[PDB]
Amino acid sequence: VKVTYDGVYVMSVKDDVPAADVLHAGDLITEIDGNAFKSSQEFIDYIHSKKVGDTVKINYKHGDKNEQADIKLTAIDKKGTPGIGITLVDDLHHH
């Protein structure tokens, strides 16, 4: 048994994107589109495999409750890269 990976912790959320109406700084994202990822890289790769305008299902914990909601992907860079519009603690550019 290897060390446990809980998911990705949100560090910042763009205030003018759909994500701002769901996520908050500090939230832990555990699954995206019904699946658990094993690293921030896999999580990001997955988002990049989608298209701006697509909808992703996000399972996350806010405070002391496991929530679930859909978030529409927006463009996170001038090149059109799809993203939720958040920065992650692993970053220590938006995803």
- Residue ranges that bind Br ion, judged by CB under 5 A: 8-9, 40, 88-90
| Residue 71: both structure tokens together | 């978030």
- Nearest residue to Br ion, by Cβ distance, number only: 90
Query: What is the closest distance, in whole angstroms, from the C-beta atom of residue 75 to Br ion in the complex?
Result: 22
Query: What is the closest distance, in whole angstroms, from the C-beta atom of residue 53 to Br ion in the complex?
Result: 25
Closest to Br ion by CB, 10 vs 17, is: 10
Distance in angstroms (rounded) separating the CA atoms of residues 9 and 61? 10
- End-to-end, the C-alpha distance of the chain in Å comes to 30
Q: Could you tell me the CA-to-CA distances from 2 to 32, 58, 66 in Å, in that order?
A: 22, 25, 24
Query: What is the closest distance, in whole angstroms, from the C-beta atom of residue 89 to Br ion in the complex?
Result: 4
